[PDB]
């Protein structure tokens, strides 16, 4: 029955083994649930409709109906899993002359850093983000060779001179064992935003055999349930590498569905949104550790709020994300902005130009695997790339393609697929020559080609001007920061960072602006004016995206009167900031009215 | 069923010590330590060797003599002690870590006679291998007689059962490993070498492999100096054997009040006089650089680098650099390499290297395949070896682009994140860098900007606190003085130096001064503000512009100068002197 | 390995009872062996000239087409092969040959392939005159791994 001496030994016993098998088989019929629809019959019918030999079993049902059985599942995963597999196979044959059973809804979920030897050789469910995946490797076979003229068996040799007598004979196979008759190897790391900053994210390797093969793509956040057990690996004797034998996989839709907030905080967020001035406060809180660069703060707030992606459909999709590029002379604290947005925005990653994805032969073994780059890893998040001006030519082409499509199609050896990355790029780089040249324009004084520049909603220039009062304020700020942080030490008002993050999440996931009304006359007249002055529809789409973002900042439904004005102001200011000195002056003079509209 | 009376007696006495020994408070400290150990990720408990020695000298002597023999029984005692006490997981590995061992042997002294006995060694990590689970107590089943062989301990090799379990059956060749039932433990292979302190001159260091397990697996990162308490053991290698130091505990190698109490009366009196010695700045510069003439500013900057500023970490997890970086761009000869050699020779923890080094590490941490194991290993480079020290890099202008970007990242973030071949690590490197370089074409064109004179990338130049330009003056007096210095040195083989302070005295004074962390007074704050106002107003033409990076370098130099006199607060004197130094280091175009 | 692909007559990229089918197959195979009729042969000859002019097709492919036409005629147990039979055989071979164009896209083991191999030769001569790094770089340069290996082997032979 139960309460033996060891759970593994107890299940191994034939008596209790068949007892549990019969009990599970009976449960395969009794459990009609309160609905009375014969849940197991429905599952069998669904499986046999497509003959998927994949059964889904909810741990809650087993625990409630049986209790003891579900309790023993964690301690003896393989045995009870085989029992359930044989029971399901027998049931399917009876109804429709191998069946794999996949469990889910495990009560406790452990992070990668949360699992240790206490969880070795047990079933567990974790939440991670895929990073790399290989093909459907055929098989891993361990071959042990009986020695030629000596009482000894050569150590296991992996596949996919005697240590004592030094016999030169070819030897004969004493024992060959097959493992992973058809398997795919993936790597899952801690989901971005759950890492403790300095700590390097944990990574683990999962093997999906037969069932679940190719059920995931690099860059996909998945809740993976499986047996975390030691096992051989492709490498005297073979190295024993701990892995997770995948039993069930899932997909976390939208890559963010926490919904974790305090209703009081939500009400406060809405009330502040009703308060118009809060928008200015948001700007003020973009860079608490910086002084000046208010325009950069507004641009970064716009990027954080991104925009509602409109989808024309087959032709294309309007990428609601706002791509920003910060360029300027050194000492402008661009990297400080990147670090700020990284630490604030959830589901964001940071990297340097010295990305996308690529297939390479995993050096640890001889196996081609696709690796998920920064862009795909971010997916529905934020990607920060510093030193963006320093990248490989292949990297430049790939990032151009990704920004043009928000998805990269890979057609490498034995791997053809497409990885989707709806990632908001906040990239930064430096001029070509360090110092910024007022005469040469943005596309000239920076070592970036025009195809990349085109796919950037906002381009901003940071100039280290020699101004006395502002420099004095900067000196005061930096001295204060240094003194207050000594190790022996221990306009509108800003917004607390926590509440700002709550606002970002809530607005980004709830409010989605629209275009019920139309000021198309004003927009078209402005575009014609710009053409008469210099502009392309790319500017128009960027303008509408940032207008949607600004509306989201105030949780507006369709649009506010100043929304289009703010979008035009931002676009025009950037466009002027990316011109020559004489051209910049001419544009400023011509557009003085539009800029003064504010 | 054979009972080792020594092992059982040691287990009994160890359990008694755990459950009776108490701190000065009268309570069992180890009870609370284990209570802390119940938490996940805490499977190793530290034990003070001196404490158990006081509790039972015979027990300590036996453990020292036969540490390896009794260690499993100590672990069993810990398991029994923790299991019955609180709600600890019924079955997870536990270990005992020993510390406070007075006997500190040298890697030279590790002889086969010391195999199996506890000992503490001090070394510097060189390379670190990936973690790997390894079977310790395997379980097998005989294929013919289908009987489960259990607890067939393996001595660090794939040791199958000698013969079947059943006397009836004698398969002896077809045992099947039960992975699930097998007991595994996580091992990491590290390599360590003799620390430069113990290294004899011109002698190749001894490389010793060590095994880390349990809490110690990730404790030691590549390039750092650490002390390991463990036991030397033998491991068979393809009756060949090789030595490996299985380390139970790993600790970092070795306050102002603590140092002063430890310091001798005469040494403390000398240091106190040094602190009270006015004009100690120039005196110490001249003492530290006898075989040099002129270049007083270079010596000042090098000394300030030797002292270093106060590192600061913000509340937002941002690290503000505390140490400074110096570069010396000089015409052919002019004693640049001499400056670097003097700095390396004087200061322990200072490592000299050249930008032409072809080592796989390449002046920074790298990932390389082991020739034998063929597994990628994180090999520490010279820059890592200079951890919390100084890296005197010569031929800095000739560095490779790979090493150039690595060094840029290191000096920017003070840490190197190395990821490749599936291996990943984040090695801390807080190292002051003293670089030597030559102008493009060999001779410095004072009518050209510094950028045009050197090939270093803009980020590298920006992240350097001070640049010192050494131009070969044609003045007859300077050449005459240089000849005088060199000839006097070569003739008066010794005694030509005039050291107002001895090298050991300077070393101990530097160690004492390091303990201070000078603060900035509001007067100092406004003085710094005004000095930066003047520096910005200068706005010239200068070789390289002036940015907030220069302000950071200024405040770091001011902190270092405050540390010079050991005063705990900044004064306008330090700020003004630092401003003078940095402003003078600026060179204007002479066109 | 790839040389074998040249000797395959046909290459494709992804009622009657079994026993009765086997009996019919055996009967036809042992009884009727067709031959190409003058009209059918002339049609095939003209078609082959057209295919060569457009181009690739090789004489071995002409023999493969002839064998396919003979099989088609045998299906109907005809002593000779009608020009319509040649047309059906040509339809099958044209399926195989447009599939072969997209297989040259798949395999290309070819004027463009020769040109790109020459490019690899020039690049390697410029570079020199680890192995894994070299292979990875050339692969990143759109060069197929098989092409790189073939160039390396050829240069070793030289
Ligand atoms: N407006 C500002 N307010 C406060 N600190 C500032 C400001 N601008 C720059 N800084 C300071 O600049 C210092 C250096 O900036 P940082 O290293 O991030 O620059 P960077 O843009 O990455 O430079 P580079 O082009 O050299 O790589 C930061 O520590 C920050 O304190
Ligand atoms: N200003 C100086 N005062 C005293 N000695 C000097 C001076 N300049 C050069 N020397 C002497 O020059 C001798 C040779 O110089 P050294 O070999 O150290 O040059 P270096 O800095 O390595 O040159 P480089 O790197 O440009 O080749 C040194 O022994 C040093 O004594
Ligand atoms: Mg930067
Ligand atoms: Mg030299
Ligand atoms: Zn043998
Ligand atoms: Zn047997």
DSSP string, C33-67: --EE-HHHHHHHHHHHHHHHHH----HHHHHHHHH
Measured between alpha carbons, how far is B499 from B522 in angstroms, rounded to an integer? Answer: 38
Show the beta-strand stretches assigned E in A135-250.
Answer: 140-146, 157-159, 172-179, 183-190, 203-209, 221-231, 241-248
Q: Give the residue from A404, A30, A343, A358 showing the smallest Cα distance to A193.
A: A343
Measured between alpha carbons, how far is B82 from B86 in angstroms, rounded to an integer? Answer: 7
Measured between alpha carbons, how far is B269 from B286 in angstroms, rounded to an integer? Answer: 22
Q: φ and ψ at B279, to 5 degrees?
A: 65, 20
Contact C74, C68 (CB under 8 A): no
Q: What is the DSSP string of B37-52?
A: HTSTT--EEEEEHHHH
Q: Closest partner residue to A174 among B173, B310, B532, by Cβ?
A: B173
Pocket test for ligand 1, best of B411, B451, B547, B549 (most atoms within 8 A of CB): B549
Radius of gyration of chain B from its Cα atoms, rounded to whole angstroms: 29
Contact B543, B584 (CB under 8 A): no
Q: Is the C-beta atom of A290 inside 6 A of ligand 1?
A: yes
Which residue has tokens 């004969």?
A172
Q: What's the number of CA atoms in the CB half-sphere (13 Å) around residue B100?
A: 10
Q: Is the C-beta atom of A477 inside 6 A of ligand 1?
A: yes
Measured between alpha carbons, how far is B383 from B362 in angstroms, rounded to an integer? Answer: 9
Cβ-count burial B366-399 (b if 16+ within 10 Å, e if not): bbeeeeeeebbbbbbbbbbbbbbbbbbbbbbbeb
Measured between alpha carbons, how far is B378 from B221 in angstroms, rounded to an integer? Answer: 9
Q: What's the number of CA atoms in the CB half-sphere (13 Å) around residue A32?
A: 6
Q: Give the residue from B366, B400, B395 showing the smallest Cα distance to B383.
A: B366
Q: What's the number of CA atoms in the CB half-sphere (13 Å) around residue C39?
A: 7
**What is the distance in angstroms between the Cα of B398 and the nearest Cα belonging to chain A?**
20
Kindly tell me the sign of the dihedral angle through the C-alpha atoms of C28, C34, C40, C41: positive
Residues making up chain B, counted from first to last:
591
Q: Closest partner residue to A486 among B134, B312, B417, by Cβ?
A: B312
* For ion ligand 4, residues whose CB falls within 5 Å: B 337
Maximum C-alpha span of chain B: 101
- Smallest CA separation from ligand 2 atom 30, residue: B335
Which C residues 83-142 touch A at CB under 8 Å?
132, 136, 140
Q: Closest partner residue to B519 among A121, A200, A486, by Cβ?
A: A486
Which residue has tokens 């030289």?
C158
Cβ-count burial B190-214 (b if 16+ within 10 Å, e if not): bbbbbbeeebeeeeebeebebbbbb
Which residue has tokens 């044959």?
A93
Helices B548-565 and A468-484 cross at an angle (nearest 10°) of 40
Q: What's the number of CA atoms in the CB half-sphere (13 Å) around residue B186?
A: 21
Please give the helix or strand (H or E) that residue B248 lies within, else none. Answer: strand B241-252
Q: Is the C-beta atom of A292 inside 6 A of ligand 1?
A: yes
Asked whether the beta carbons of residue C145 and residue A413 sit closer than 8 angstroms, the reply is: yes
Structure tokens at B401: 């682009």
Asked whether the beta carbons of residue A394 and residue C140 sit closer than 8 angstroms, the reply is: yes
Kindly tell me the sign of the dihedral angle through the C-alpha atoms of C137, C142, C146, C148: negative
Q: How far apart are the first and last CA of chain C?
A: 22
Which residue has tokens 């109906």?
A65
Q: Which residues touch B260 (CB under 8 Å, ≥6 apart)?
A: B268, B512
Contact B336, B394 (CB under 8 A): yes
DSSP code of residue B197: T
Structure tokens at B69: 């023999």
Residue of A355, A360, A371 best to disrupt the C interface, most CBs of C under 10 A: A360
Which residue has tokens 């009062």?
A469
Q: Closest partner residue to A116 among B41, B539, B551, by Cβ?
A: B41
List residues in chain A that are followed by a break over 2.5 Å (C to N).
97, 160, 235, 354, 490, 534
Q: Is the C-beta atom of A428 inside 6 A of ligand 1?
A: no
Q: Which residues touch B60 (CB under 8 Å, ≥6 apart)?
A: B49, B52, B53
Measured between alpha carbons, how far is B119 from C93 in angstroms, rounded to an integer? Answer: 81
Q: Is the C-beta atom of A462 inside 6 A of ligand 1?
A: no
**What is the distance in angstroms between the Cα of A177 and the nearest Cα belonging to chain B?**
10
Show the beta-strand stretches assigned E in A531-571.
Answer: none
A458 beta partners:
A324
Q: Closest partner residue to A478 among B158, B176, B551, by Cβ?
A: B551
Q: Is the C-beta atom of A135 inside 6 A of ligand 1?
A: no
Ligand nearest to the CA of B143: 6
Contact A240, A233 (CB under 8 A): yes
Q: Is the C-beta atom of B548 inside 6 A of ligand 1?
A: yes
Q: Which residue of A has its CA nearest to B534?
A: A468
Q: How far apart are the first and last CA of chain B?
A: 93
| Chain centroid offset of residue C66 CA | 14
Asked whether the beta carbons of residue A479 and residue B528 sit closer than 8 angstroms, the reply is: yes
**What is the distance in angstroms between the Cα of C124 and the nearest Cα belonging to chain A?**
19
Resolution of this entry, Å: 3.5
- Taking the C-alpha atoms of B202, B207, B212 and B217 in order, what is their torsion angle to the nearest 10 degrees? 60
Measured between alpha carbons, how far is B320 from B323 in angstroms, rounded to an integer? Answer: 9
Helices B336-346 and B296-307 cross at an angle (nearest 10°) of 30
Measured between alpha carbons, how far is A103 from B20 in angstroms, rounded to an integer? Answer: 49
- Smallest CA separation from ligand 1 atom 16, residue: A333
DSSP code of residue A381: S
Structure tokens at B531: 């000095």
Contact residues on chain C for A416, CB-CB shorter than 8 A: none
A248 beta partners:
A225
Contact residues on chain A for C132, CB-CB shorter than 8 A: 361, 363
Which residue has tokens 């100068």?
B561
Contact residues on chain C for A363, CB-CB shorter than 8 A: 132
A413 touches chain C (CB under 8 A): yes
Q: Is the C-beta atom of A333 inside 6 A of ligand 1?
A: yes
**What is the distance in angstroms between the Cα of A363 and the nearest Cα belonging to chain C?**
10
Show the beta-strand stretches assigned E in B253-402.
Answer: 312-313, 319-320, 326-330, 350-354, 366-369, 376-379, 390-394
- Smallest CA separation from ligand 1 atom 4, residue: A290
Structure tokens at B365: 């941490």
Which residue has tokens 């140490």?
B323
Q: Is B333 annotated as a binding residue?
A: yes
Q: What is the 3-state secondary structure (H, E, C) of A54-109?
A: EEEEEHHHHHHHCCHHHHHHHHCHHHHHHHHHHHHHHHHHHHCCCCEEEEECCCCE
Binding residues of A for ADP: 335-336
Q: Which residues touch C106 (CB under 8 Å, ≥6 apart)?
A: C13
Pocket test for ligand 1, best of A286, A294, A333 (most atoms within 8 A of CB): A333
Touching subunits of C (3+ CB pairs, under 8 Å) are A
A360 touches chain C (CB under 8 A): yes
Helices B5-20 and B67-83 cross at an angle (nearest 10°) of 50
* DSSP three-state, residue A394: helix
Measured between alpha carbons, how far is A572 from A589 in angstroms, rounded to an integer? Answer: 12
Measured between alpha carbons, how far is B33 from B45 in angstroms, rounded to an integer? Answer: 7
Please give the helix or strand (H or E) that residue A502 lies within, else none. Answer: helix A497-510
Contact residues on chain B for A481, CB-CB shorter than 8 A: 314
DSSP code of residue B204: P
Across the beta sheet with B326-330, the strand order is B350-354, B390-394, B432-437, B326-330, B466-470
Which residue has tokens 């649930």?
A33
Q: Which residues touch B219 (CB under 8 Å, ≥6 apart)?
A: B212, B226, B250
Measured between alpha carbons, how far is B490 from B487 in angstroms, rounded to an integer? Answer: 5
Contact residues on chain A for B406, CB-CB shorter than 8 A: none
Q: What is the 3-state secondary structure (H, E, C) of B50-112?
A: HHHHHHCHHHHHHHHHCHHHHHHHHHHHHHHHHHCCCCCCCCCCCEEEEECCCCEECHHHCCH
C145 touches chain A (CB under 8 A): yes
Q: Is the C-beta atom of B482 inside 6 A of ligand 2?
A: yes
Show the beta-strand stretches assigned E in B323-382.
Answer: 326-330, 350-354, 366-369, 376-379
Distance A334 CA to ligand 1 centre (A): 6
Contact C36, C62 (CB under 8 A): no
Contact A357, A373 (CB under 8 A): yes
Q: Is the C-beta atom of A390 inside 6 A of ligand 1?
A: no
Beta strands A203-209 and B423-428 are unpaired
Q: Which residue of A has its CA nearest to C145?
A: A413
- Smallest CA separation from ligand 2 atom 2, residue: B293
Classify the phi-psi angles of B556: left when phi > 0, otherwise alpha if psi is within -120 to 50, otherwise beta: alpha
Structure tokens at C142: 């759109």
């Amino acid at each position: 029955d139960l309460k033996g001496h060891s759970v593994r030994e107890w299940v191994s016993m034939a008596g209790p083994r068949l007892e549990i098998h019969h009990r599970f088989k009976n449960f395969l019929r009794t459990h009609v649930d309160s609905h009375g629809h014969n849940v197991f019959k429905e599952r069998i019918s669904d499986m046999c409709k497509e003959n998927r030999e994949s059964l889904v079993v909810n741990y809650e049902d087993l625990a409630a109906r049986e209790h003891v059985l579900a309790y023993f599942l964690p301690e003896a995963p393989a045995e009870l899993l085989q029992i359930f597999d044989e029971a399901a196979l027998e049931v399917v044959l009876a109804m429709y002359p191998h069946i794999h059973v996949r469990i889910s809804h495990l009560p406790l979920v452990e992070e990668l850093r949360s699992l240790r030897q206490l969880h070795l050789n047990q079933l567990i469910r974790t939440s991670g983000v895929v990073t790399s995946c290989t093909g459907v490797l055929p098989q891993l076979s361990m071959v042990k060779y009986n020695c030629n003229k000596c009482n000894f068996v050569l150590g296991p040799f992996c596949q996919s001179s005697c240590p004592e007598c030094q016999s030169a004979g070819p030897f004969e196979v004493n024992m060959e064992e097959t493992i992973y008759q058809n398997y795919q190897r993936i790597r899952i790391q801690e989901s971005p935003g759950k890492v403790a900053a300095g700590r390097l994210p944990r990574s683990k390797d999962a093997i999906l055999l037969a069932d679940l093969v190719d059920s995931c793509k690099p860059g996909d956040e998945i809740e993976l349930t499986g047996i975390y057990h030691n096992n051989y690996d492709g490498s005297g004797f073979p190295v024993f590498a701990t892995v997770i034998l995948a039993n069930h996989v899932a997909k976390k839709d939208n890559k963010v569905a926490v919904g974790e907030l305090t209703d009081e905080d939500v009400k406060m967020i809405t009330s502040l949104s009703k308060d118009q001035q809060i928008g200015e406060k948001i700007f003020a809180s973009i860079a608490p550790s910086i002084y000046g660069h208010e325009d950069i703060k507004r641009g970064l707030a716009l990027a954080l709020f991104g925009g509602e992606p409109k989808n024309p459909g087959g032709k294309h999709k309007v990428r609601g994300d706002i791509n920003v590029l910060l360029c300027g002379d050194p000492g402008t604290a661009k990297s400080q902005f990147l670090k700020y947005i990284e630490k604030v925005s959830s589901r964001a990653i940071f990297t340097t130009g010295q990305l996308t994805a690529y297939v390479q032969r995993h050096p640890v073994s001889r196996e081609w695997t696709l690796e998920a780059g920064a862009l795909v890893l971010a997916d529905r998040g934020v990607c920060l790339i510093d030193e963006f001006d320093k990248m490989n030519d292949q990297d430049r082409t790939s990032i151009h393609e990704a920004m043009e499509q928000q998805s990269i199609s890979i057609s490498k050896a034995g791997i053809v697929t497409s990885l989707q990355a709806r990632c908001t790029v906040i990239a930064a780089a430096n001029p070509i020559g360090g110092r910024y040249d007022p005469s040469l324009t943005f596309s000239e004084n920076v070592d970036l080609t025009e195809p990349i520049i085109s796919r950037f909603d906002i381009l901003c220039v940071v100039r280290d001007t020699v101004d006395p009062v502002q420099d004095e304020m900067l000196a005061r700020f930096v001295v204060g920061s240094h003194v207050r942080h000594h190790p022996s030490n221990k306009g509108v008002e800003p917004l607390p960072q926590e509440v700002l993050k709550k606002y970002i999440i809530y607005a980004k996931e709830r409010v989605h602006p629209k275009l019920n009304q139309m000021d198309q006359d004003k927009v078209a007249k402005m575009y014609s004016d710009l053409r008469k002055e210099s502009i392309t529809v790319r500017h128009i789409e960027s303008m509408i995206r940032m207008a949607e973002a600004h509306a989201r900042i105030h949780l507006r439904d369709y649009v506010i009167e100043d929304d289009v004005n703010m979008a035009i102001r931002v676009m025009l200011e950037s466009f002027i900031d990316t011109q020559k000195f004489s051209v910049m002056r001419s544009m400023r003079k011509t557009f003085a009215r539009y800029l003064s509209f504010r | 069923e054979v009972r080792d009376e020594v092992a059982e007696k040691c287990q009994k006495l160890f359990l008694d010590f755990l459950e009776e020994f108490q701190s000065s408070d009268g309570e069992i400290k180890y009870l609370q330590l284990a209570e802390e150990l119940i938490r996940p990720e805490r499977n190793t408990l530290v034990v003070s060797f001196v404490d158990l020695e006081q509790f039972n000298q015979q027990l300590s002597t036996t453990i020292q003599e036969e540490f390896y023999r009794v260690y499993p029984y100590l672990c069993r005692a810990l398991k029994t002690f923790v299991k019955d006490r609180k709600e600890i997981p019924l079955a997870k590995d536990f270990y005992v870590a020993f510390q406070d061992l007075p006997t500190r042997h040298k890697i030279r002294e590790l002889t086969s006679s010391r195999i199996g006995l506890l000992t503490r060694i001090s070394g510097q990590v060189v390379r670190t291998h990936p973690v790997h689970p390894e079977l310790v107590s395997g379980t097998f089943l005989c294929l013919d007689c289908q009987t489960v062989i259990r607890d067939v301990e393996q001595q660090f090799k794939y040791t199958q059962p000698n013969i079947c379990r059943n006397p009836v059956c004698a398969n002896r060749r077809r045992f099947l490993l039960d992975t699930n039932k097998s007991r595994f433990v996580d091992f990491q292979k590290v390599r360590i070498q003799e620390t430069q302190a113990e290294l004899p001159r011109g002698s190749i260091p001894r490389s010793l492999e060590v095994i880390l397990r349990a809490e110690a697996v990730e404790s030691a990162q590549a390039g750092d100096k650490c002390d390991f308490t463990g036991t030397l053991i033998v491991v068979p290698d393809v009756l060949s054997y090789r030595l490996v130091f299985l380390a139970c505990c790993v600790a970092p190698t070795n306050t102002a009040e603590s140092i002063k109490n430890q310091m001798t009366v005469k040494e403390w009196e000398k240091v106190f006089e040094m602190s009270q010695d006015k004009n100690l700045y120039h005196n110490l510069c001249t003492s530290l650089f006898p075989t040099i003439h002129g270049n007083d500013e270079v010596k000042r900057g090098v000394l300030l680098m030797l002292f270093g500023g106060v590192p600061k970490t913000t509340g937002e997890g941002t690290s503000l650099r505390g140490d400074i970086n110096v570069c010396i761009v000089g015409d052919p000869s002019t004693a640049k390499s001499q400056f670097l050699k003097h700095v390396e020779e004087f200061s322990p923890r200072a490592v000299y290297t050249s930008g032409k080094a072809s080592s796989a590490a390449g002046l920074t941490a790298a990932v390389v395949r082991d020739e034998e194991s063929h597994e990628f290993v994180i090999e520490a480079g010279a820059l890592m070896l200079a951890d919390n020290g100084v890296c005197c890099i010569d031929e800095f202008d000739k560095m490779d682009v790979r090493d150039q970007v690595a060094i840029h990242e290191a000096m920017e973030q003070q840490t190197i994140s190395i990821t490749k071949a599936g291996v990943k690590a984040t090695l801390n490197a807080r190292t002051s860098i003293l670089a030597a370089a030559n102008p493009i074409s060999g001779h410095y064109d004072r009518s050209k900007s510094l950028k045009q004179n050197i090939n270093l990338s803009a980020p590298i130049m920006s992240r350097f606190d001070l640049f010192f330009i050494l131009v070969d003056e044609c003045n007859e007096v300077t050449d005459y003085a240089i000849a005088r210095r060199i000839v006097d040195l070569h003739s008066r083989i010794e005694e030509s130096i005039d050291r107002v302070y001895s090298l050991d005295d300077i070393r101990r004074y530097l160690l004492f001064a390091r303990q201070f962390k000078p603060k900035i007074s509001k007067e100092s704050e406004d003085f710094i503000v005004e000095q930066y106002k003047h520096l910005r107003q200068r706005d010239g033409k200068s070789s390289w512009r002036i940015t907030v990076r220069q302000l950071e370098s200024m405040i770091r130099l001011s902190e270092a100068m405050a540390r010079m006199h050991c005063c705990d607060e900044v004064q306008p004197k330090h700020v003004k002197e630092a401003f003078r130094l940095l402003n003078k280091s600026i060179i204007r175009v002479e066109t | 390995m790839p040389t074998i692909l040249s000797r395959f007559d046909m290459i494709f990229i992804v009622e009657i009872d079994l026993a009765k089918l086997k009996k019919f197959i055996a009967y036809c195979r042992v009884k009727c062996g067709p031959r190409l009729s003058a009209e059918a042969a002339e049609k095939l000859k003209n078609r082959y000239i057209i295919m060569r002019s457009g181009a690739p097709i090789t004489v071995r492919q002409l023999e493969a087409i002839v064998r396919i036409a003979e099989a088609l005629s045998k299906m109907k147990l005809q002593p000779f092969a009608t020009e319509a039979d040649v047309e059906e055989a040509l339809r099958l071979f044209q399926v195989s040959t447009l599939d072969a164009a997209l297989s040259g896209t798949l395999s290309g083991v070819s004027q463009e392939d020769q040109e790109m191999l020459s490019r690899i030769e020039k690049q390697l001569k410029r570079r020199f005159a680890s192995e894994h790094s070299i292979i990875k770089d050339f692969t990143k340069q759109k060069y197929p791994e098989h092409a790189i290996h073939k160039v390396l082997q050829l240069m070793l032979r030289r």
